[PDB]
Structure 1
Amino acid sequence: MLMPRRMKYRKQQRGRLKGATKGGDYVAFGDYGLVALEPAWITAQQIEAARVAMVRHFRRGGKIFIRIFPDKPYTKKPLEVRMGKGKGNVEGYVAVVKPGRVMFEVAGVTEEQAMEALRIAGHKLPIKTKIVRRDAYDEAQ
């Protein structure tokens, strides 16, 4: 799928989502990027679906950069079970995304293909997106 090979701990506390991405806000790799506008937990099955959606779109073409990674475990109790008796079992992993985060990047692809590409990938994401270019996104120094 797209989980981590090993982890010191298998289940971990839920947490929260205070706006601002902290990091990952500029392009820095490809030419066009997809930036998250709402905060959320993106399941690896979505990251995946979106990715495949792009390669599928411009089959045999440019390069894709997945800027996020699902390292946070998702717990879910069984069905018809009551509360308590311990924490649920891990059902998958998710990457936490905050507003401003550049989730994906593309390169070696026409500006038409780039747009269309990311527009399809955002239709697989639980949130709202924005497509970007490159310019001040040059924190080289």
Structure 2
Amino acid sequence: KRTKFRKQFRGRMTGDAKGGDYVAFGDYGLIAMEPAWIKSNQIEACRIVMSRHFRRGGKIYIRIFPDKPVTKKPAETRMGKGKGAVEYWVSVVKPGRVMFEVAGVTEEQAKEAFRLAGHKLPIQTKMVKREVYDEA
């Protein structure tokens, strides 16, 4: 989740979904249908749940690592700086972007993992199979 080394602070914007795929790194995968920021802890949630369902593994891939320092108002008011370094880090996610990829388990075994992990998400999602090869 939270990154190791940086500069400081950030802005915010929304484009299309660029770096990210339909598939890779495994058999099935979950993809975001809605533009958002994803909290580090939210990923930790999807992760931990999917790791609840797969007792053993190494078949879980999260392409979604967040780096976006966000700052929030400390207690109250206005007079003062723009401040508040540590609130949380997020990973902007735009539709089509691959969120999760899991492999080695069944159809159903993917379905449920994605449902549970999906209920932890601020946005819509869906699971798919593979056809297309863009790059390699």
Per the TM superposition, whether the score is higher than 0.5 is: yes
What do the CA deviations read for 1:1-20 (whole angstroms, capped 9, x no partner)?
Answer: x111101x12112x2112x2
What do the CA deviations read for 1:99-141 (whole angstroms, capped 9, x no partner)?
Answer: 11010000111111111111111110100001111111x2246
Q: Percent identity?
A: 61
The residue that corresponds to 2:56 in the other structure is 60
The residue that corresponds to 2:42 in the other structure is 46
Q: Which of 65, 71, 80 is the matching residue for 1:69? A: 65
- TM normalised by structure 1 equals 0.89
- Count of residues in Structure 1 that have an aligned counterpart in Structure 2: 135
Q: Supply the RMSD in Å over aligned alpha carbons.
A: 1.3
1:10 corresponds to which letter in structure 2?
Answer: Q
Classify 1:114/1:62 alpha carbon distance in 2 versus 1 (closer, same or farther; 3 Å). farther
Runs of at least 5 residues in structure 2 that lack an aligned partner in the other structure = none
Q: Which of 11, 14, 17 is the matching residue for 1:17? A: 14
On the 8 A contact 1:38/1:98 being kept in 2, the answer is yes
Greater fraction strand: 1
- TM normalised by structure 2 equals 0.92
What do the CA deviations read for 1:18-58 (whole angstroms, capped 9, x no partner)?
Answer: 2x211202211111111101100000000110011001012
The residue that corresponds to 1:88 in the other structure is 83
